[PDB]
Amino acid sequence: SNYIHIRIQQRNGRKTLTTVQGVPEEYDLKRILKVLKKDFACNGNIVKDPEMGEIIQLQGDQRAKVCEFMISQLGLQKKNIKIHGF
């Protein structure tokens, strides 16, 4: 249940977008986007996708860094969250 994983979508000119799918509601999302923006210097979106869920889209190609934020903010598991190569 409620598995967590991150994906990378490429673009023109090597530019990349990162998506974490599934976020616990224990901590709210705007309060988390605020500190995502500073620590990442990348634009972010709390987008709604049907049958998928709320997604915090972020710019760039960063996986260990969103994970490093996750380990400190709410995540205490580091086992359910999956990293995708792509």
């Binding site: 249940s1 598995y3 994906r7 995708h84 190569g85 792509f86």
Partner: protein, 105 residues
């Protein structure tokens, strides 16, 4: 695991042997794979072909995860379990031990 990369296409011409040696039905394995990965691929007659850029490491790790959470017993060292449906859910049952443990995700 043998992963054939053909341009945009990712081929597994060996998934039949994976299903046979792990004593798992092929369609259940495909369901698990596409619940893990976000793709919808086809099967040719014996081989699982998908359209994407997927590495061999991902295939190896999903096989290991399937082994640890589905194939081998989580309380004993045994593969002798197989797939059944006890009210409507998948309820795994073993043959060497017969223990009632079930994982459906």
């Amino acid at each position: 695991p043998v992963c054939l990369r053909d341009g945009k296409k990712t081929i597994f011409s060996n998934i039949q042997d994976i299903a046979e040696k792990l004593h798992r039905s092929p369609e259940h394995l495909i369901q698990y794979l596409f619940a893990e990965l976000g793709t919808s691929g086809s099967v040719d007659g014996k081989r699982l072909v998908i359209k994407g850029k997927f590495q061999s490491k991902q295939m190896e790790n999903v096989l290991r995860r399937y082994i640890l959470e589905y194939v081998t017993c989580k309380t004993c060292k045994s593969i002798n379990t197989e797939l059944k449906r006890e009210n409507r859910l998948f309820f795994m049952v073993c043959k060497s031990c017969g223990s009632t443990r079930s994982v459906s995700s």
